[PDB]
């Protein structure tokens, strides 16, 4: 059971079992699938109708007829960018302040922390490119959505491999810390 705690989700930090790919030493990349959750249906073979964004019905985190393997199996409800504007903007505010702060706390070197800040700078400036990334999705934890608290907002990206369109999850390392409980 791996226990994850964000610098902002330190309230309801939780325990799961999922492997990740740390890209550029900045963010964790997770591999997803396009699948359905319905009490009377299971058809995910549809390789033809695209998605871009989630669904409309109040299916609830784990019971959303239309979604991605990543969120449905981890109980994450969709939050739309038009409303999440204040939420992710607030998280990025706390995040940027906290990550640089904790980084200069231990490393001090103005040449290194500036390089790190450049990593996240490129990530956010590109990610916040509204008109293109317009079809991104912010999925928040069941506990938070139901508790109205500061749960983790996971970044759901659209990305195809050689043409095969897969949902890619990303989370920032300097925000998400892990607790190792296997053996």
From Swiss-Prot:
One of its GO terms (molecular function) is calcium ion binding. One of its GO terms (cellular component) is cytoplasm. Residues 1-181 form the TCTP domain. It is found in: Cytoplasm. Pfam families: TCTP. InterPro entries: Mss4-like_sf, Mss4/transl-control_tumour, TCTP, Translation_control_tumour_CS, Translational_control_tumour_p. It comes from the Eukaryota. Involved in calcium binding and microtubule stabilization. Belongs to the TCTP family. This is Translationally-controlled tumor protein homolog. It comes from Caenorhabditis elegans.
